[PDB]
Every structure is written in structure tokens, then in C-alpha cells.
Amino acid sequence: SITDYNYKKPLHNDYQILDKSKIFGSNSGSFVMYSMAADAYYIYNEKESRKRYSPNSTYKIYLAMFGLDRHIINDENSRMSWNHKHYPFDAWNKEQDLNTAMQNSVNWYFERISDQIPKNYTATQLKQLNYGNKNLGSYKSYWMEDSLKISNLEQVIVFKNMMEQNNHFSKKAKNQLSSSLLIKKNEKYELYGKTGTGIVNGKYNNGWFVGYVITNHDKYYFATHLSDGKPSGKNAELISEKILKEMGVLNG
Ligand SMILES: OCc1cn(Cc2ccc(C(F)(F)F)cc2C(F)(F)F)c(=S)[nH]1
Fold this sequence. Notes:
The protein has 252 residues and is an alpha+beta fold. The protein has helices at 21-24, 46-49, 60-69, 98-103, 107-115, 119-129, 152-164, 171-181, 233-246, and strands spanning 14-17, 28-35, 40-44, 52-53, 150-151, 182-185, 189-200, 203-215, 219-228.
């Protein structure tokens, strides 16, 4: 488990190193993007980009996909009733479907899905997907500052391969996942994605924003990871949006 903290595997792809240190400011981390048309990677801070961290709520993407694949939820019914437990956000204190649960990052919805997934299925999936260290640990909220870790570079590779390769996941599941992840749509683009935020002893420790953008001309998968400064998911999102705008990926 010595180089289970690091993704070592070489890129046999065209890649361009970027300098986005200005946009990151006093935050430390990395940015990775992949263009379907160029079949190429663009990386800021390749060293940080290969260090593995807890995915936090970004892993809800995969819990959603597994739920759909095992028919725990589906396109007829993805609704789950509140357990009449008071959370500090009223968006959580009610019935959810996949869309509301993903949009509002409702932990209990995804936990209930995880509870119905046999560990052996999860281990098969993480292996086939090449998901980070594939370490399920205790198999209790293992994605939330626990045993499972994944690098920024791997977040892009694994998500792009899951969505874009012909694998055992159905088109219909990918479409429903996609719908739950949609954040912004205008005449120029559709922006999909999911934040994650780790907190350790009341401080932000681990910030993510993982997603993809469809334009008229291309499709880009991307992820920002923050390891220091104000490393929150919201900050990772803002930084992501700045970088994509600058690169011409977002207009309007
Ligand atoms: O890993 C934890 C984590 C979850 N999120 C998203 C999150 C968390 C809480 C709420 C809400 F409770 F306020 F609703 C909404 C969302 C979001 F809408 F952004 F998805 C981030 S950022 N980090």
C-alpha cells in the first residue's frame, strides 16, 4: 500500500502542461481536462494531479450508477422517503429522487443505496473501472474521508471511460446519471458536474469538482482538486469555471 497513494501509470496520450497558478491563487491543487476531439489531456500541476485523495461526494456519481445498474433505483421510480431525521439543511429533510439527491448532495439517499449494494459487486466494479486504490476498507461510508482514494488525473480518466466506452452500464443509466448532474445549459454549452468537500476537525481539507462540458464542437471531461488554502468543493467549482471560461470552453 506504499504507492497506493499515487497513480504512477504513464499517459500514452498527447498532453499539454498548463500554468493556472494565477487562478488558483493561495489555494494548492491541480486541474485536469480531457478533450474527446483531440484525445488529449491538459494538466496543471501533474505531481498533485497524481496524488490520491478521498473522493468524498464526487463518489455519489458512482453510487448513482451502481444503484441504477442494480435497479435499486430506476427511471420509473428513484424516489426515497425521508427517515424523519432532522438535518441542518431543509433540502435534506424531505423525500428525494436521484436529481434532488444529487443536486443537494443528500448523504442519506446515497448511504441507503450503498447499504443495498453487496461488497463483492462494488469490488468488481472498482476493478473494472480502475477506480483509484479500490480500497473499500470497512465498507461503511468508505468514500467519505476513509479508505477509498483516487487522484485528480484518475477522476477524469475513470469518468470519461465509464461514460464513453461500451461497457456493461446501459445507455439509459448513463442518461439518467447525466440528467442528475446537469448544472448549466445555454446556447453554447451544457455543464455537468459534482462537488465534494472533506472536513477534518472543523477545517476544509479536500475540495473537488468533477464533471464534463458538451459544446457544439467538442466534449470535455475535467476535474479540479484542492489540497490546501480553502480546499472546499464550492471553491473547486469556481476555479474550474474560471479555467474553462478562459480556455474558451464556456461562452455566454
Ligand atoms: O463531500 C461532501 C460534499 C457535498 N457537497 C455538495 C453539497 C453539500 C451540501 C449541500 C446542502 F446541504 F446545502 F444542500 C449541497 C451540496 C451540493 F448542492 F453542492 F451538491 C460538497 S461541495 N461537498
